[PDB]
Nucleic acid binder design. Structure first.
Length: 132
DNA sequence: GGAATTCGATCGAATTCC
DNA sequence: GGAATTCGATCGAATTCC
């Protein structure tokens, strides 16, 4: 459908902490680092999947951000895989951080609109798809 | 009725193919 | 390498089965 067809990176991003994802299990998670929003902005993406792997790959290229992550998780982001969330933050076999579109795609949501993109935990992500 | 399999929105990772 | 395709996953409302 939509997150599969190509698109263009757009958005400002937000200024971020040294404890970024630290609050990814609350409300709508952690925003997309402006520092990263700058790097990805105006880039062409085949699918959201393409954007995701590129996204985490930029995080690993960031001194400030990649330092907050374990050597292990950095190894995964270097190849496009998402970071591993804290156990108390996982939901079944879903264990990697998830990117949530604030305004659903099935409701005309910017697929590649970094201002509509956020980082969450599987646990929290689920409570979002049911109002809680 | 009420338990069981499906469906369809939302996800990330592995495999296939050129 | 990179793109497309395919496989796994959790959940609630929905449909299918006795």
């Amino acid at each position: 459908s939509k997150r599969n067809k190509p698109g263009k990176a757009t958005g400002k991003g937000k200024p971020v902490n040294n404890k970024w994802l630290n609050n990814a299990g609350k409300d709508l998670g952690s925003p997309v680092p402006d520092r990263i929003a700058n790097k990805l902005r105006d880039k062409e993406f085949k699918s959201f999947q393409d954007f995701r792997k590129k996204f985490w790959e930029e995080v690993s290229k960031d001194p400030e951000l990649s330092k907050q992550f374990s050597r292990n998780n950095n190894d995964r982001m270097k190849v496009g895989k998402a970071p591993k969330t804290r156990t108390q933050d996982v939901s079944g076999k879903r264990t990697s951080f998830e990117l949530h579109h604030e305004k659903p795609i099935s409701q005309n949501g910017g697929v590649y609109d970094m201002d509509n993109i956020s980082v969450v935990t599987p646990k929290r992500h689920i409570d979002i798809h049911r109002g809680k």
